[PDB]
C-alpha cells in the first residue's frame, strides 16, 4: 500500500493564488483539503486513523500553518528569481510514504514546477533531481537556511508518515479488502479496415484494482486481445474493456472470460 | 557585516528630490528599507532581492527603491512631503534571517 | 500592532534590576531578537531566541521565550548609567531570508545615576 497526499498549487499572477490537495492510500480517497475550505476533509470514516483528536488537531493546525506559509513562499520567491521566472506558475507536490511487511518504510516528497520533477526532500535538506534547471539553486539555498521547516519536515517524513499509515491501514482493513463482484457486457464496433471487425468485452464494478480479462476460442487463449486502461467509477470501483481483432465470420464460436477475487472460483464466461 | 547610510543626515524643502543612499560591502543578494517613528516599529517601504529588483514593501507610497548593483540600495523621494520627516534605517542579509542594519539617516521636510 | 511591549516607559535606580515584556501575536514565530536602541544611535542586538522553550543570557543580560504562550521577557541584572535606551522586541517569522521583521513600538529605560 502506497500513501499520497497531493498537492496542487496554481498561481496566475502576483495577487490570485489557490491550492488544493487530495489524499490517497492505494486506490481509495482517504482525505480533501481545497482552497476554500480552512480544515482537512475527510472522505472515509477511519481517515484519522489510529490518532487521537488532539493528536489530529496538533497535525492539522501544522498543514493550516504551512499552507499560507508556502503560498508566500512561492510568490516571494518568483519576485527574487525576476524576470528570470513569471507567472502562471503551477507547483505541485507529492509527499507520503509506501508501506512494506515487518515495520518497514520509504518515505518521499516530490516537487514539481510546471508539470516537470524538479525538487525532492533527501536526508535533512532540499535537493534538485537530475534534469532541474540551475536557476533553483538559489531557492533551494533559501529553503535550507530554515533549519526549523527542515527539522518539521524529516520528523513528518520519518517518524509521523510511518506509524500514521500503519494505523490507517488497521482502521481502513475492511474497506480496502472489500470484494466487488464484476458485471461483464458484449458488444461489436466495425474497424476501419474492410473486413475485420473489433469485439469488445465490457467489465465493471470490480475491486481491488488486479483482474484478469482474456478472449477465449472455447478453451484456446487469443494472443490478439488488447487490454486497454483501468477506468474509475463513481463508486470507488473499477472499469474495463479488452478488444479483439476478429474478421467477419471468426465471431460465432468465441467468448470473453474474466477472473477476479471477488468472482471466487467461478469465472464469468459470455457466449457471442 | 557592517553597512553604510550617505547621509547621516538631512534637511530638504516639501517637493524637493531626496535619494538616501546605502552601500555595504558584504556580497549580500538582498537588502531593506525601513522608516522608524515615534509610537511605532520599523515599517519596512521598500526591498531588493538582487540588482535590478525593487520590491514594494508594507508601506511604498511615496517613495520609490533603486538598485543599481550589488552593493548600492537608494530610496528615491520624488516630491518630498513633510510626513516623510523620519529616521531612515538600511538593512542587508544573505540566505539567512539575519538583517544587518545601518547606523541611519535622519531627514527633515520643511516647507 | 502584531509586537507589542510594557511597560511603554520606566525609571530605574543604579543597581536595581529592570524587567520588560513582549508579547506578539505573529504567526509563524521562527524568532525573537531584543534590540538596544540609544538615543540618536542605531540598532544594538542583545540576543536572539529561537526554541520553543528558550532561555539566553548575555552578560547583564538574560532573556526567555515562550512560544505556546506568545510572549518574552528582558532581565536587566544591575542596571548602569549607560543602560539608558530604547529596547526593541523583533519577532521574524520566517528561519531564511523570505522572513519579515515584526518590531514592537519600544520600552523607554531611564537610569538614575
Known amino acids: 500500500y502506497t500513501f499520497r497526499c497531493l498537492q496542487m498549487s496554481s498561481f496566475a499572477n502576483r495577487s490570485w493564488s489557490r491550492t488544493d490537495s487530495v489524499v490517497w492510500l492505494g486506490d481509495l480517497q482517504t482525505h480533501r483539503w481545497s482552497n476554500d475550505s480552512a480544515t482537512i476533509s475527510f472522505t472515509k470514516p477511519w481517515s484519522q486513523g489510529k490518532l487521537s483528536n488532539q493528536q489530529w488537531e496538533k497535525l492539522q493546525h501544522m498543514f493550516q500553518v504551512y499552507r499560507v506559509s508556502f503560498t508566500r513562499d512561492i510568490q516571494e520567491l518568483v519576485k527574487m528569481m525576476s524576470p528570470k521566472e513569471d507567472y502562471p506558475i503551477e507547483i505541485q507536490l507529492s509527499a507520503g510514504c509506501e508501506m512494506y511487511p515487518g515495520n518497514a518504510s520509504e518515505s518521499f516528497l516530490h516537487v514539481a514546477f510546471q508539470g516537470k520533477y524538479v525538487v525532492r526532500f533527501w536526508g535533512t535538506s532540499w535537493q534538485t533531481v537530475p534534469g532541474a534547471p540551475s536557476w533553483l539553486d538559489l531557492p533551494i539555498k533559501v529553503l535550507n537556511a530554515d533549519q526549523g521547516t527542515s527539522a518539521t519536515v524529516q520528523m513528518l517524513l520519518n517518524d509521523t508518515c510511518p506509524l500514521f499509515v500503519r494505523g490507517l491501514l488497521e482502521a481502513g482493513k475492511s474497506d480496502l479488502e472489500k470484494q466487488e463482484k464484476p458485471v461483464a457486457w458484449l458488444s461489436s464496433v466495425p474497424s476501419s479496415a474492410h473486413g475485420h471487425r473489433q469485439l469488445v468485452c465490457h467489465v465493471s464494478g470490480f475491486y481491488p484494482k488486479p483482474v484478469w480479462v482474456m478472449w477465449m476460442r472455447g478453451d484456446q487463449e487469443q494472443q490478439g486481445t488488447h487490454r486497454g486502461d483501468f477506468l474509475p467509477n463513481a463508486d470507488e470501483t473499477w472499469y474495463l474493456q479488452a478488444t479483439l481483432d476478429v474478421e467477419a465470420g471468426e465471431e460465432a464460436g468465441l467468448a470473453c472470460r474474466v477472473k477476479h477475487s471477488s468472482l471466487g472460483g467461478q469465472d464469468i464466461i459470455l457466449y457471442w | 557585516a557592517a553597512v553604510t547610510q550617505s547621509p547621516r543626515n538631512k534637511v530638504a524643502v516639501t517637493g524637493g528630490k531626496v535619494t538616501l543612499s546605502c552601500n555595504q560591502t558584504?556580497?549580500?543578494?538582498?537588502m531593506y528599507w525601513y522608516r522608524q517613528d515615534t509610537g511605532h516599529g520599523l515599517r519596512l517601504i521598500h526591498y531588493?532581492?538582487?540588482?535590478?529588483?525593487?520590491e514594494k514593501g508594507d508601506i511604498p507610497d511615496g517613495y520609490k527603491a533603486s538598485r543599481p548593483s550589488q552593493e548600492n540600495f537608494s530610496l528615491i523621494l520624488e516630491l518630498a512631503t513633510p510626513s516623510q520627516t523620519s529616521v531612515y534605517f538600511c538593512?542587508?542579509?544573505?540566505?539567512?534571517?539575519?538583517?544587518?542594519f545601518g547606523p541611519g539617516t535622519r531627514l527633515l521636510v520643511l516647507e | 500592532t502584531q509586537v507589542e511591549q510594557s511597560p511603554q516607559s520606566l525609571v530605574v535606580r543604579q543597581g536595581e534590576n529592570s524587567v520588560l515584556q513582549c508579547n506578539y501575536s505573529?504567526?509563524?514565530?521562527?524568532?525573537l531578537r531584543w534590540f538596544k536602541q540609544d538615543t540618536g544611535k542605531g540598532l544594538v542586538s542583545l540576543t536572539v531566541l529561537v526554541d520553543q522553550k528558550d532561555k539566553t543570557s548575555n552578560g547583564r543580560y538574560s532573556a526567555t521565550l515562550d512560544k505556546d504562550a506568545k510572549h518574552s521577557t528582558l532581565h536587566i541584572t544591575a542596571t548602569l548609567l549607560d543602560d539608558t535606551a530604547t529596547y526593541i522586541c523583533?519577532?521574524?517569522?520566517?528561519?531564511?531570508?523570505?522572513?519579515?521583521?515584526?518590531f514592537g513600538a519600544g520600552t523607554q529605560l531611564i537610569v538614575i545615576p
Open positions: 531588493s532581492y538582487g540588482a535590478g529588483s525593487t
Open positions: 523583533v519577532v521574524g517569522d520566517r528561519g531564511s531570508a523570505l522572513g519579515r521583521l515584526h
Open positions: 558584504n556580497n549580500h543578494n538582498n
Open positions: 505573529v504567526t509563524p514565530d521562527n524568532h
Open positions: 538593512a542587508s542579509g544573505d540566505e539567512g534571517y539575519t538583517q544587518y
